[PDB]
Each structure stands twice: as C-alpha cells, then as structure tokens.
Design an enzyme around this catalytic site. Sequence first.
Site, short mmCIF file in Angstrom:
data_model
loop_
_atom_site.label_atom_id
_atom_site.label_comp_id
_atom_site.label_asym_id
_atom_site.label_seq_id
_atom_site.Cartn_x
_atom_site.Cartn_y
_atom_site.Cartn_z
N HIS A 74 -41.98 82.25 69.42
CA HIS A 74 -41.97 80.91 70.02
C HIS A 74 -43.17 80.09 69.54
O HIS A 74 -44.23 80.64 69.24
CB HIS A 74 -42.00 81.03 71.55
CG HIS A 74 -40.63 81.34 72.07
ND1 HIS A 74 -39.73 80.35 72.43
CD2 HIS A 74 -39.98 82.53 72.27
CE1 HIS A 74 -38.60 80.96 72.83
NE2 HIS A 74 -38.69 82.29 72.75
N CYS A 135 -38.68 80.08 65.61
CA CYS A 135 -37.30 79.61 65.67
C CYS A 135 -37.26 78.08 65.69
O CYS A 135 -36.48 77.46 64.96
CB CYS A 135 -36.61 80.14 66.94
SG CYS A 135 -36.06 81.85 66.66
#
Length: 158
Positions: A74, A135
């Site tokens: 993240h 991501c």
Amino acid sequence: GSHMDASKIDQPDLAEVANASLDKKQVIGRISIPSVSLELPVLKSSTEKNLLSGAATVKENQVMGKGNYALAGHNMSKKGVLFSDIASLKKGDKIYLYDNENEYEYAVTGVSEVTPDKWEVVEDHGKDEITLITCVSVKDNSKRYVVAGDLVGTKAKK
C-alpha cells in the site's frame, strides 16, 4: 498488464483494512525492512483483501533468489502502514526476505519513479534482483515510487 483493472484497490478506508481478515494459510514467506522498521508476511495470492494485511507478490510463479522478485504494498503515504515509506530506502539498504525455509539478504541499488505502464521494472531481467512497488498511489494519472535492489547473499532460516 491484463486489463490494468487488477490494481483497482483504491486507497481503502482503515475500517476495511482493520476489519479485513488475514488467512495465514496464504503465507509463503516474510519481508523485513529495518530501514522503515517494517516486518510483514509474504502472501502469494495477490488479492485486494490479502494486500490489506501484508505485502503480496505480483506474479504467480515467482521464486525468491531467482529472477526479479516483485512485491506490491500500500502507498497510503502513512508511516507505519504497508509500503508507506519505501521511497525512504537509501542505496545499500539491507532488505531481509524469507522463503520456504530460507532467508535472503537483499540490498537496495537505487530508488526511482516510473509510470505504471512501465512494468519492465517488475518484470524478470535475468538475475537475482528484488523490486518493491505499490498497487495504487496518489492517482492513476499520477506517478509512483519504486525501489530496486540486488541480491547480496542467502542463508537458511535458523
């Protein structure tokens, strides 16, 4: 990279992450990064749910110590979260990665920012290298921070 809609994780709310459950049954290794005081499990199954509790591998038939090992996390941009401070890693930073029963010593060679379409940075080159990415970051149009490192050594996990 597929329909590019795979990384549609979108900065999720802490409520989803905090409530998200982790299947330790999907743990195949571990990632340790003293530089940021980050310790996490390596989940082979790269899913939007799995990424909420640790760093997930990008490919399927990836092997630690062989080829470019891609790891995604993240980018919440919050110290303490997953991959929340990868761009802090300096060249020659010690990265400890765990495989089946092996501990791999990886060292950062250089940090850079590349578009999301340039997957060449996550793709295998032909050596024992490591690549850390995320991501989603800031915005789709925006760019992302990526850290590349080289294999320095390996040993057995106790």
